[PDB]
Design an enzyme around this catalytic site. Structure first.
Site, PDB file in Angstrom:
ATOM      1  CD  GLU A 160      51.479  40.582  53.802  1.00 22.03           C
ATOM      2  OE1 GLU A 160      51.335  39.725  54.698  1.00 22.03           O
ATOM      3  OE2 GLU A 160      50.580  40.865  52.983  1.00 22.03           O
ATOM      4  CG  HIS A 208      35.781  38.176  48.422  1.00 18.52           C
ATOM      5  ND1 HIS A 208      36.229  38.843  47.301  1.00 18.52           N
ATOM      6  CD2 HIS A 208      36.719  38.380  49.378  1.00 18.52           C
ATOM      7  CE1 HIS A 208      37.385  39.423  47.567  1.00 18.52           C
ATOM      8  NE2 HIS A 208      37.704  39.158  48.821  1.00 18.52           N
TER       9      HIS A 208
END
Lengths: 597, 97
Positions: free
Chosen positions: A357, A487
């Site tokens: 991150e 997805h």
């Protein structure tokens, strides 16, 4: 005076107003994820709908400036974002139906469940129930029931909904000057008007095809290794020369072999690197893990973080009354305000997740000075690939021994590195052709090469040929397996995973060379190399203002995807797989199935 | 002045010009709201195709960064003129022996 002042002036008007409007939606999402309530979700949705309306109202003036005679790449890229209509080309009935399809498809995917034939009263939901069955449970029947019933209960229901999604989206893309919605996804890497750096939409289909053939030598050896290992657990179903069943891959979609590490240990007697106890013994916390992780970023030569970055970030879940989203997510709140959400624990799993991150922030913070329309990534690969290269180098024991987590007396040997190296290949090498398989199938569906009734027939055919996987029970034309993916049902592009993977080792080979590293890349560590971070920041600051091929030409040594850094990373693994495959068959045979007789 | 001038929603009282038909002079002031006309067509006091309202407000919100926060800036221009001088700082003084 000239027409050029109109675009230069209009984009400045949009870059001023759209900047604060976009941030109002981003901070509202931060406020929602930090405190999941009924008031914040409305502020999140009201803000997003407000900014979304601002984009369509501004497209009126964007289309009044033809880019035919314009050579300024900055003016071309910014206006092309707003000049395109997208879903606005069709009527409200077709647009509303498309949203109802995705909302209906997403709900059926999330609410899927399977109970045993012998115990109907305990049906396990998609998450966490059925996921553990394909990941943790080693029972042949539990993995088979979860796979087949999922395809029958969820796969069949998502088959008819996927038709209008492909049909409605093709009409949307075709109106926007595309061949299909498959080509619409390929337009992300489009480059026009640059000498020696132009990129056509159809070139992506050739790149995955070329690189797949170069991945096959490494994939065929690992597949034989996995088949030989899984054959020991399931000898009455897996042939030593045949294919691997689909329900024994490790998940409910057949994408990763990361869950098969327990069944495919190279050396179950040798140790592995793990500092979960070293951090607990050293009295580390969520802040010290992040703070000591920042020392890696500043050591390599990248910019350090601000006081507003750390002061306003989230380290834990603030109680159940104000339960926040513990998912790792790098946030760009705007005006230099960057933050990360994570419920960090003292363990090596969160140690590398912190660098991931934090790596995403280094991407966004680099090109923060660009215009608003250009303050974004050049493509999907550059976004997520740069986050992995920083965490992987941190996972190297050279960095841990320097920081003081891994003790210096830990012995390093080729037998120990294969444990960490092959475990990674199950995630990387066991995923590269699967994404090439799916997107190749999906791309043909949008184009219309595969009939709607031949989805399962061509899908099963591609599974035997490309990946060498076979279903546990044969499926007829009423089934639709790949539509049950997250997805696919949520209208996301999965080709970025293939591009991000090859780009990951490409950047790693570039920074490992910037670290003056020698040998394979699996032992690479860029710690305390000031030139390493400096070489990366020169690329991160580009954003989407320049061609993406240019960023690769002067950094990684190519303009497209390449398998060259993948083999160097898994160089000794190819030797190891060669020895273990001596009593097996490299590759696979499409004639074998677990239900054969 | 982020803790003083920043306001939720942006301090709309502090504004600035983005475009002008000509470059200002040293220490020049221009507070006109004339529309920046780029093309041959007339703006008719409203912006649009080849027309733009030159003034915009600042986004001085409390969440701004170091590069976007408000800063109370003051410029001190001096003038060495033939006319006599008027102001210099305090001179040192000590005891009386």
């Amino acid at each position: 005076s000239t027409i050029e002042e109109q675009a230069k002036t209009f984009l400045d008007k949009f870059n001023h107003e759209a900047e604060d409007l976009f941030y109002q939606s981003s901070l509202a999402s931060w406020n929602y994820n930090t405190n999941i309530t009924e008031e914040n979700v409305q502020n999140m949705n009201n803000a997003g709908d407000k900014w979304s309306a601002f984009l369509k109202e501004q497209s009126t003036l964007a289309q009044m400036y033809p880019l035919q005679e314009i050579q300024n790449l900055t003016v071309k890229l910014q206006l092309q974002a707003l000049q395109q209509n997208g879903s606005s080309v069709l009527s409200e009935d077709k647009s509303k139906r498309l949203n109802t399809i995705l909302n209906t498809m997403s709900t059926i995917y999330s609410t899927g469940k399977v109970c045993n034939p012998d115990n109907p009263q305990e049906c396990l939901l998609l998450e966490p129930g059925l996921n553990e069955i394909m990941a943790n449970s080693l029972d042949y029947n539990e993995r088979l029931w979860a796979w087949e019933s999922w395809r029958s209960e969820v796969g069949k229901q998502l088959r008819p909904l996927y038709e209008e999604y492909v049909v409605l989206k093709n009409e949307m893309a075709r109106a926007n000057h595309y061949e299909d919605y498959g080509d619409y996804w390929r337009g992300d890497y489009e480059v026009n008007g640059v000498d020696g750096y132009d990129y056509s939409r159809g070139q992506l289909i050739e790149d995955v095809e070329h690189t797949f053939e170069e991945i096959k030598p490494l994939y065929e050896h690992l597949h034989a290794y996995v088949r030989a290992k899984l054959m020991n657990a399931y000898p009455s179903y897996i042939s030593p020369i045949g294919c691997l069943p689909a329900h024994l891959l490790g998940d409910m979609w057949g994408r990763f072999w990361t869950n098969l590490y327990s069944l495919t240990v190279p050396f179950g007697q040798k140790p592995n690197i793990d500092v979960t106890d070293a951090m607990v013994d050293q009295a580390w916390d969520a802040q010290r893990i992040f703070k000591e992780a920042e020392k890696f970023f500043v050591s390599v030569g990248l910019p350090n973080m601000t006081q507003g970055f750390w002061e306003n970030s989230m380290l834990t879940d603030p109680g159940n009354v104000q339960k926040a989203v513990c998912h790792p997510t790098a946030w760009d709140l705007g005006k230099g305000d960057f933050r990360i959400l994570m419920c960090t624990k003292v363990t090596m799993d969160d140690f590398l997740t912190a660098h991931h991150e934090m790596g995403h922030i280094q991407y966004d913070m680099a090109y923060a000075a660009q215009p608003f329309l250009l303050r974004n990534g050049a493509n999907e690969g550059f976004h997520e690939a740069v986050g992995e290269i920083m965490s992987l180098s941190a996972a190297t024991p050279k960095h841990l021994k320097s920081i003081g987590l891994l003790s210096p007396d830990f012995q390093e040997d080729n037998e120990t590195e294969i444990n960490f190296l092959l475990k990674q290949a199950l995630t990387i090498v066991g995923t590269l052709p699967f994404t090439y398989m799916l997107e190749k199938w999906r791309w043909m569906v949008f184009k219309g090469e595969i009939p709607k009734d031949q989805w399962m027939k061509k899908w099963w055919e591609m599974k035997r040929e490309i990946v060498g996987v076979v279903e546990p029970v044969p499926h007829d034309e009423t089934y639709c397996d790949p539509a049950s993916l997250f997805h696919v049902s949520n209208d996301y592009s999965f080709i970025r995973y293939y591009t991000r993977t090859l780009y990951q080792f490409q950047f790693q080979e570039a920074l490992c060379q910037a670290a003056k590293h020698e040998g394979p890349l699996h032992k690479c560590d860029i710690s305390n190399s000031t030139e390493a971070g400096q070489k990366l920041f020169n690329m991160l600051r580009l954003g989407k203002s320049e061609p993406w091929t240019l960023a690769l030409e002067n950094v990684v040594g190519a303009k497209n995807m390449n398998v060259r850094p993948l083999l160097n990373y898994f160089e000794p693994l190819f030797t190891w797989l060669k020895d273990q495959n001596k009593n097996s068959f490299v590759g696979w045979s499409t004639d074998w199935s677990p239900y054969a007789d | 002045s982020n803790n003083l001038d920043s306001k939720v929603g942006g301090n709309y009282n502090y504004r600035y010009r983005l475009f002008r038909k000509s470059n200002l002079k040293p220490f020049e002031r221009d507070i006109s709201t004339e529309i920046y006309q780029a093309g041959s067509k007339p703006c008719n006091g409203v912006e649009g195709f080849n027309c733009y309202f030159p003034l915009q407000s600042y986004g001085f919100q409390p969440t701004n960064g170091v590069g976007y926060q408000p800063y109370r800036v003051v410029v001190l221009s001096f003038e060495l003129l033939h006319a006599p001088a008027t102001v210099c700082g305090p001179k040192k003084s000590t005891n009386l022996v």
